[PDB]
Amino acid sequence: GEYPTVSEIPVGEVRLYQIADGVWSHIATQSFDGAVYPSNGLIVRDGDELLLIDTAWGAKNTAALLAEIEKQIGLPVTRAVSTHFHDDRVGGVDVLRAAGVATYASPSTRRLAEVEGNEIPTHSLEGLSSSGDAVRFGPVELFYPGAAHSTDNLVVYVPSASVLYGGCAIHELSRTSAGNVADADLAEWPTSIERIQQRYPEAQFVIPGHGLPGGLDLLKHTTNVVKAHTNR
Ligand SMILES: [Cl-]
Ligand SMILES: [Cl-]
Ligand SMILES: [Zn+2]
Ligand SMILES: [Zn+2]
Predict the structure, then answer these.
(1) Can 33 be counted among the known catalytic residues?
(2) How far is CA 74 from the centre of its chain?
(3) Mind listing the UniProt keywords for this protein, alphabetically (predicted)?
(4) What angle do CA 46, 76, 31 make, to 5 degrees?
C-alpha cells in the first residue's frame, strides 16, 4: 500500500499502516515552526493484545490514535513505551494511563521528562542505561544505541517481522537537515548509528521518526545528514 502522507491525514487525525504481519506504524500530522509533517510511531501485536510505541503528541491526538487502533485493529493496547523524553513522544501518556494502558520508559527518559515538565511514563525500563544495552519486551527488543537525537533515545526492533523503528535517531531520505538538535549529541550520533547497524544488519524495514519508511540505507543517510550538520 501507498504510505500515508500529510495530504491523506488532516491535522488531528491518525492513520495506521500495516508494515508486516502484526506490525503497524501510526502516523499523525503535526505542526511545528511554520510547517506540517507526518510523525511515525509503532504498534506491535502481542498475543491478543497490542504494544504501542510512542504517543501521537498530545492528549487529543493520542485519544484519536486509540480510536483509530480500535477502528482498524480492535485489540486492546495494554502497554506503551516512549522512545525519548520529548513532548512529541511522551505527550499523551496521561491519556494512555487514564485508558488503562501501562506506560513505560527508561529511568533516563523519566528523569529528563520530569526536568522538562513533560508527562512521565509510570513504569521504569531497567537494563538500558549503557550504550549497546538491549532488553526483550514482549514482541520487541528495546535497544539503547547511545546518545544521538537525545541522550536517552531508544530504538525498537520486531524480530518476527524484521522491522526497526528508530524514532528521531533515524532520518527519512527526504530530510537534509539534522532536525531539532537542541538536546542531541552530535559527536556520538554516528557511533550510535553504527551500533544499530551492527546489531540489526538483517533489518528489512526501517521506520524513521518522521516520514517515509525505507531500508537500512536510512542509517547511512542519517550519518550523511549528521556529518553535514557537524561540518556546517
Ligand atoms: Cl540499568
Ligand atoms: Cl517480555
Ligand atoms: Zn526529540
Ligand atoms: Zn542520503
Answers:
(1) no
(2) 22
(3) Antibiotic resistance, Hydrolase, Metal-binding, Periplasm, Signal, Zinc
(4) 100
- Told to judge if 123 belongs to the known catalytic residues of this protein, a careful annotator would answer no
What was the structure determination method? X-ray
Q: Which position has the grid cell 539503547? A: 144
Cell of 6: 500529510
8 A C-beta contact, residue 177 and residue 107: no
Which one is catalytic: 84, 171, 210, 221? 84
Asked if residues 150 and 86 have their Cβ atoms less than 8 Å apart, the reply is: yes
Q: How many CA atoms are closer than 13 Å to the CA of 116, on its beta-carbon side? A: 19
Q: Which residues surround ligand 3, an ion (CB under 5 A)?
A: 86, 168
Q: Which domains does the chain have, with CATH numbers?
A: 1-232 (3.60.15.10)
Counting runs of H as helices and runs of E as strands, what totals does the chain give? 6, 12
Separation of CA 163 and ligand 2 centre (Å): 18
**Resolution for this experimental structure (Å):** 1.9
Positive or negative, the CA dihedral 135, 141, 142, 148 is positive
Closest CA to 43 of 113, 115, 140, 187: 140
- All three cell numbers of 213, joined, read 519508511
- Among all chains, which residue has been given the C-alpha cell 488532516? 10
